[PDB]
Nucleic acid binder design. Structure first.
Ligand SMILES: [Mn+2]
Length: 176
DNA sequence: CGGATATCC
DNA sequence: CGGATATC
């Protein structure tokens, strides 16, 4: 897919927020805009985007196996490059051009960890995780872990997570 | 099967 | 000077 401007990316996502669904048990089930979070370079407000990244909050674990694998987009021509329960890479047609649209899923309990992870940028994640690794912790898009045990942080938002991990908060467009 | 090899932030 | 996913 080609690079997009920030405005083009936003236009695509606004189109998608009313047109995403999944096919399951003979039903075409709407993915609510409520549960669609822009992530990646779009959330970082980069002036040129590599692709469009969306995080879908799946509020029911047993549905993970059925959401991305049966993803449907009304009013859009697209093909699927790879597609599993957690990552689905699509190539969409938009105004005579092809763009990459990446879809990822998070469960409710994972949400702040997922937003933090998928926001990036990669260089920033590597430095943060390196520091935590030195203290025998592991951070990923699902949680914070010590000795392969989930560390039960009392947090709701990404901002709260960052503070709880002991790092300086920066808005998405200022992380590097 | 999955270890090997494309991929994501 | 990280960590996880998809395909076969
Ligand atoms: Mn992407």
């Amino acid at each position: 897919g080609g690079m997009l401007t920030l405005i083009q990316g936003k236009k695509i996502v606004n189109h998608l927020r009313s047109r995403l669904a999944f096919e399951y048990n003979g039903q075409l089930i709407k993915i609510l805009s409520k549960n669609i979070v822009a992530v990646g370079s779009l959330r970082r407000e980069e002036k040129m985007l590599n692709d469009v990244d969306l995080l879908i909050i799946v509020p029911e674990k047993k549905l993970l196996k059925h959401v991305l694998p049966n993803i449907r987009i009304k009013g859009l021509s697209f093909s699927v490059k790879v597609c599993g329960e957690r990552k689905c890479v699509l190539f969409i047609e938009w105004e005579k051009k092809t763009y990459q649209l990446d879809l990822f899923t998070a469960l409710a309990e994972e949400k702040p960890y997922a937003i933090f992870h998928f926001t990036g940028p990669v260089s920033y994640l590597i430095r943060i995780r390196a520091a935590l690794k030195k203290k025998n912790y592991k951070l990923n898009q699902y949680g914070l872990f010590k000795n392969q045990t989930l560390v039960p942080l009392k947090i709701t938002t990404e901002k709260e997570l960052i503070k709880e991990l002991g790092f300086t908060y920066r808005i998405p467009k200022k992380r590097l």
